[PDB]
Amino acid sequence: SHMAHQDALPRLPVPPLQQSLDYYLKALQPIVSEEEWAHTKQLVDEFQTSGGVGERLQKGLERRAKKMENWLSEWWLKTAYLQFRQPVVIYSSPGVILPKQDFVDLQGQLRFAAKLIEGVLDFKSMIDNETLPVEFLGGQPLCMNQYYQILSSCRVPGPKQDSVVNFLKSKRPPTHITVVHNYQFFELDVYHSDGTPLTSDQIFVQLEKIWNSSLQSNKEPVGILTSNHRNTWAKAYNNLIKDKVNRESVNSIQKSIFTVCLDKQVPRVSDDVYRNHVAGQMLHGGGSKFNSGNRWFDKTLQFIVAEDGSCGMVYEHAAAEGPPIVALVDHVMEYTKKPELVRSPMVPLPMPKKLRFNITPEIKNDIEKAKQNLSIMIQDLDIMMLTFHHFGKDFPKSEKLSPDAFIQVALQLAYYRIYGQACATYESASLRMFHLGRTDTIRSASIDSLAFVKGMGDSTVPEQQKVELLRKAVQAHRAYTDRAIRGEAFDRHLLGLKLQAIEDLVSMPDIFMDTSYAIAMHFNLSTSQVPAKTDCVMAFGPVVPDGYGICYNPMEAHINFSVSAYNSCAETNAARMAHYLEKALLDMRTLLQNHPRAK
Ligand SMILES: CC(C)(COP(=O)(O)OP(=O)(O)OC[C@H]1O[C@@H](n2cnc3c(N)ncnc32)[C@H](O)[C@@H]1OP(=O)(O)O)[C@@H](O)C(=O)NCCC(=O)NCCS
Ligand SMILES: C[N+](C)(C)C[C@H](O)CC(=O)O
Numbered sequence: 388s389h390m391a392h393q394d395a396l397p398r399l400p401v402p403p404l405q406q407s408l409d410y411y412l413k414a415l416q417p418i419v420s421e422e423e424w425a426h427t428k429q430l431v432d433e434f435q436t437s438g439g440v441g442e443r444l445q446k447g448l449e450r451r452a453k454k455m456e457n458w459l460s461e462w463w464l465k466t467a468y469l470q471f472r473q474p475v476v477i478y479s480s481p482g483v484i485l486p487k488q489d490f491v492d493l494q495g496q497l498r499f500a501a502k503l504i505e506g507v508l509d510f511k512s513m514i515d516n517e518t519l520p521v522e523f524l525g526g527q528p529l530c531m532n533q534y535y536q537i538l539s540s541c542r543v544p545g546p547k548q549d550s551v552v553n554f555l556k557s558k559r560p561p562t563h564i565t566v567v568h569n570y571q572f573f574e575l576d577v578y579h580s581d582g583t584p585l586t587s588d589q590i591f592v593q594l595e596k597i598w599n600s601s602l603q604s605n606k607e608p609v610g611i612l613t614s615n616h617r618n619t620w621a622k623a624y625n626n627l628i629k630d631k632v633n634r635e636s637v638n639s640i641q642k643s644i645f646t647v648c649l650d651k652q653v654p655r656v657s658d659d660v661y662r663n664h665v666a667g668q669m670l671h672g673g674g675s676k677f678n679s680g681n682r683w684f685d686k687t688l689q690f691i692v693a694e695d696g697s698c699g700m701v702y703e704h705a706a707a708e709g710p711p712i713v714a715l716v717d718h719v720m721e722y723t724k725k726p727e728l729v730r731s732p733m734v735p736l737p738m739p740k741k742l743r744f745n746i747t748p749e750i751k752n753d754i755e756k757a758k759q760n761l762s763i764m765i766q767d768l769d770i771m772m773l774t775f776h777h778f779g780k781d782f783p784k785s786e787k788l789s790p791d792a793f794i795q796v797a798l799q800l801a802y803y804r805i806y807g808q809a810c811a812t813y814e815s816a817s818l819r820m821f822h823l824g825r826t827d828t829i830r831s832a833s834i835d836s837l838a839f840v841k842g843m844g845d846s847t848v849p850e851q852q853k854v855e856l857l858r859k860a861v862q863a864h865r866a867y868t869d870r871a872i873r874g875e876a877f878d879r880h881l882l883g884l885k886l887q888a889i890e891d892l893v894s895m896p897d898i899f900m901d902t903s904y905a906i907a908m909h910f911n912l913s914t915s916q917v918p919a920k921t922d923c924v925m926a927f928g929p930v931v932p933d934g935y936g937i938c939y940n941p942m943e944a945h946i947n948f949s950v951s952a953y954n955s956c957a958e959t960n961a962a963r964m965a966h967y968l969e970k971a972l973l974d975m976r977t978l979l980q981n982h983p984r985a986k
Contacts, residue, residue, distance in 0.1 A: 561642045802964075
């Protein structure tokens with residue numbers, strides 16, 4: 388059973404204080420001045436001295452670990468998501484771009500959506516029955532809690548901070564999904580009164596009814612309300628549900644197992660930016676004129692099936708990281724490729740319930756304000772999708788090098804080539820080997836990565852020397868990665884010491900008000916890898932105004948990349964960063980090939 392598996396998992400550890408502070412100073416060397424570093428060095432010594440502030444905070448964290456299942460869980464969920472007030476669109480909820488399907492008309496679009504729905508329900512059977520296979524990372528069993536948070540759940544806006552509702556294990560678990568077409572929501576039961584799930588054929592007939600019941604695109608796009616600032620949406624949400632019917636419609640959406648978005652046809656765009664527009668459709672919907680209103684962004688799982696064959700999803704981040712999401716994607720996509728079983732006669736099926744919304748002058752105004760906000764967000768988003776066809780994990784592996792480290796080092800090289808200096812860099816590391824573990828930070832900008840990028844562009848340094856520097860940077864990254872997944876990284880630890888100080892009601896330690904800490908936590912490069920058997924890729928907006936958001940799916944012979952930036956910062960450009968990234972990867976392969984290890 389699930390519980391048995393979870394109880395046997397090790398608990399999130401609290402790293403030794405001095406250990407983390409040492410790693411911290413090392414990670415700072417490449418991104419802060421010598422002056423700033425020397426000062427931080429002093430603060431660190433004082434902070435960790437016997438009988439000092441840091442020691443007391445550390446003991447507090449160790450006590451916290453003794454009284455909780457995971458000392459970090461609640462703090463992280465709160466600081467990273469629930470208390471993050473920016474719209475979840477672009478800034479938080481990752482978009483997922485899946486392989487384009489071959490359907491050429493309404494028939495095929497609905498057939499695929501029906502197959503996808505059946506596929507998700509098949510995956511859900513393992514969740515309900517707790518038969519989901521155990522996963523590993525570094526030869527260690529992984530926490531499976533995230534899988535019990537993604538279905539039949541939804542984020543709920545709150546005036547100060549948000550909350551999340553989960554009905555997967557309620558006395559009466561939801562048996563319906565929600566489907567939105569032309570901004571109109573429908574409540575669709577996907578299980579028979581006997582408990583068995585509907586088949587793809589049966590689901591198709593229902594989607595057909597749903598489509599015919601929403602041919603008109605006149606209804607207000609109430610769903611676009613979910614794309615506004617959380618403080619604003621909290622107020623609009625509270626007003627929206629004052630109405631009996633509206634509250635019931637919202638309730639159905641929140642309880643639904645998941646949402647399926649049947650997107651409308653959109654204006655054909657140039658082939659040189661097609662991929663970018665698809666990424667935009669999955670991330671934000673394209674705008675109030677396209678599909679942004681055909682969504683409910685508070686919903687944990689939203690599957691999008693476009694009119695032109697493109698498909699993907701957007702998920703609310705409070706529930707999980709990408710891997711569990713792709714595990715579902717891989718299972719589902721492979722499911723849509725299964726044969727067509729002999730289908731028995733069509734049985735009587737009820738009419739999918741339409742979830743109506745009563746619009747008032749106030750709600751209408753909120754909707755228009757949301758349209759305006761989103762329009763601004765979209766205009767400011769700069770996306771460049773890059774299909775790196777040259778090679779994938781295959782080359783780095785043939786060189787006895789970690790593909791992920793190779794890619795991260797390449798990104799450090801590309802950034803240095805453009806800006807002439809390194810920058811605070813974030814890469815997601817899974818902490819799932821621990822009970823309820825989410826993530827920690829792998830810092831890609833290091834002493835060794837800086838040494839490599841500097842040497843790489845130095846026309847006075849020999850190629851063979853550059854090869855050594857390259858391998859050393861990759862090894863240093865792999866080492867950091869190994870420590871991160873084992874709870875030996877330091878970022879979540881320092882955050883914990885800061886939150887502990889706040890809770891202890893003591894003055895904010897100088898170490899956290901230090902300029903170096905501010906620099907270290909301002910990630911001009913925020914990245915993550917989300918490996919999948921499916922040839923998909925994910926995307927997300929930068930975490931700082933002057934930064935980039937980069938995600939990739941390294942496959943065997945190619946790598947799918949997404950690069951985002953904000954137009955408000957003249958110093959960043961997604962296309963340029965992508966170009967330099969592609970060239971950095973190629974130059975690194977060239978360098979290594981120019982000097983085989985054997986001779
Ligand atoms: C950081 C992280 C991505 C590293 O994963 P990883 O699988 O170790 O990545 P690597 O680059 O090492 O690649 C591993 C593959 O290359 C191989 N490899 C690694 N190092 C190698 C080496 N030195 N020589 C030859 N092969 C090597 C591995 O055997 C593996 O082979 P495979 O392709 O058959 O699977 C992972 O630990 C992690 O934390 N993942 C989750 C990230 C996440 O949460 N993302 C979403 C955030 S919302
Ligand atoms: C996108 N990014 C890297 C900012 C956040 C990750 O998705 C999740 C995490 O690293 O906690």
